[PDB]
Design a binder for this molecule. Structure first.
Ligand code: HEM
Ligand SMILES: CCCCC[C@@H]1O[C@@H]1C/C=C\CCCCCCCC(=O)O
Length: 465
């Protein structure tokens, strides 16, 4: 391929980044922010400032990788460092996480990265026999509550009930603990939300005018001290609930304190936060796919479950072709976490589809995943949600291009990479979500809107079987 100069510029100091930040949050939004510049530069690889800049990030300058050929460089640990850039060009204060640099911020070359990731592998593996009955029991309550709300109001706010459900499910599946039986009561969603806000506010817009938002959440960090006691409530819950997992932490040579802050982060930020983005988006997309798709999903899931003697099992789910594919299409069409960063360890040649580009050691690389996963030179009808995309031998090959987990879907998280530790779990619970919906309902209608993180979704009808 021809070597090309990386297009784009960073504009003037201070003023360049601010204008790019207004574009990103207010005047264009992220998708059009990235696409308008692809069109301008005639390149899917270019230089751009990324938020937050201001006083929170020291350097907003990145090289954006916005196609599915160049983006995978971000998985390659021989090529990029993955230290302290989970949230990009800035890092939330370790005051927010008990003074620790949590697993998600550690490079694979740090020994504690191996210990902590192995701990989460154990967390997940040791919960395998609770996932099914706990998901089915807690999500059954969710849908009871949603049917109730629909009959009262004529619509049912999904996100307003499903946040509690997700956390209840995680506590019971991961720790055999019902939050209702603890001091947390039903408080966890609110505590986690505030704490996540304190972590992620430099990257978020909450719909307020820019005159308020910019000074309040985009220039300076929100003080960690103001969430410290909310965090302590969550910490004490993990300390008292994580008994069996803490013995294994002890065996792995991890302090009880470090294990607990890490278990909290993994459950509350990685898992519950990812679920908080994913499930309402799934409802939105599946809802938009229409009633014929719902009926086909319903017929598949029910038949397969009946063929399995009414028992839902891991192996039964492998039969549910459209179900597996729909889940994959949700993850491709709309990756829940869109921002992946990596610092070039050495000088690199990054190939895109029509040119190659030279980056120097130390440059921050950034990918906006939905432009890699909706890349029209990799996927046909790339901006269409196609439920059956991954069905059959030929569709399954395309999975290596589904990147939600910070790696190809065909690859496994290891202690050596930075691929999502809960990869298999996420795909599992997302499938169980679809299974629970369509073993109850032949179809549904939604009303949708925007959320600071993902989507705001209402059911306006739920057609029971
Ligand atoms: C639907 C929910 C989830 C979503 C959307 C999601 C997405 C992601 C993404 C994109 C990354 C890469 C971060 C980066 O380096 O830029 C990541 C990393 C990570 N995730 Fe997940 N994830 C989810 C659930 C989970 C679960 C269930 C676990 C269970 C323990 C988990 C644990 C982790 C950990 C420990 C890392 C850092 C990996 C490492 O340092 O090697 N996440 N996740
Ligand atoms: C809300 C919690 C996000 C899900 C957590 C899961 O561990 C991955 C998060 C990876 C990087 C976090 C970046 C924070 C921005 C999240 C929303 C905006 C976006 O999608 O980029």
């Amino acid at each position: 391929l021809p070597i090309r100069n990386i297009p784009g510029n960073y504009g003037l100091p201070i003023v360049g980044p601010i204008k790019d930040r207004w574009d990103y949050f207010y005047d264009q939004g992220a998708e059009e922010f990235f696409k308008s510049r692809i069109r301008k530069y005639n390149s899917t690889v270019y230089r751009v400032n990324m938020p937050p800049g201001a006083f929170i990030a020291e350097n907003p300058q990145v090289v954006a990788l916005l196609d599915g050929k160049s983006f995978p460089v971000l998985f390659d640990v021989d090529k990029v460092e993955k230290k302290d850039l989970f949230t990009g060009t800035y890092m939330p204060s370790t005051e927010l996480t008990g003074g620790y640099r949590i697993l998600s911020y550690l490079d694979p070359s740090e020994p504690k990265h191996e210990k902590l990731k192995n701990l989460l592998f154990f967390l997940l593996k040791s919960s395998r026999n609770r996932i099914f009955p706990e998901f089915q029991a807690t999500y059954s309550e969710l849908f009871d509550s949603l049917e109730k709300e629909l009959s009262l109001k004529g619509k049912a706010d999904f996100g307003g009930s499903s946040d509690g459900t997700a956390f209840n499910f995680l506590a019971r599946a991961f720790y055999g603990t019902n939050p209702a039986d603890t001091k947390l009561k039903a408080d966890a969603p609110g505590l986690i939300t505030k704490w996540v806000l304190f972590n992620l506010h430099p990257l978020l817009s909450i719909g307020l005018p820019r005159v308020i938002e910019e000074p309040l959440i985009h220039t300076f960090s929100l003080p960690p001290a103001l969430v410290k006691s909310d965090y302590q409530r969550l910490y004490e819950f993990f300390l008292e609930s994580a008994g069996e997992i803490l013995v294994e932490a002890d065996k792995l040579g991890i302090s009880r304190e470090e294990a607990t802050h890490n278990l909290l982060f993994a459950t509350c930020f990685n898992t519950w936060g990812g679920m908080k983005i994913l499930f309402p988006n799934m409802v939105k997309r599946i809802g938009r796919a229409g009633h014929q798709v719902h009926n086909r999903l319903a017929e598949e899931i029910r038949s397969v479950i009946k063929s399995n003697g009414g028992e839902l099992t891991m192996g039964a789910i492998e039969k549910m072709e459209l179900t597996k594919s729909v889940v994959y299409e949700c993850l491709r069409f709309e990756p829940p976490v869109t921002a992946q960063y990596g610092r070039a360890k050495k000088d690199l040649v990054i190939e895109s589809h029509d040119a190659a580009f030279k980056v120097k050691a130390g440059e921050m690389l950034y990918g906006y995943q939905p432009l890699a996963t909706r890349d029209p030179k990799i996927f046909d009808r790339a901006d269409e949600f196609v439920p059956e995309r991954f069905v059959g031998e030929e569709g399954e090959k395309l999975l290596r291009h589904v990147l939600w987990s910070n790696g190809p879907e065909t690859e496994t998280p290891t202690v050596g990479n930075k691929q999502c530790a809960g990869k298999d779990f996420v795909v599992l619970v997302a499938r169980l979500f679809v299974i629970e919906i369509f073993r109850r309902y032949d179809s549904f209608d939604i009303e949708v809107g925007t959320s600071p993180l993902g989507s705001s979704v209402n059911f306006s009808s739920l057609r029971k079987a």
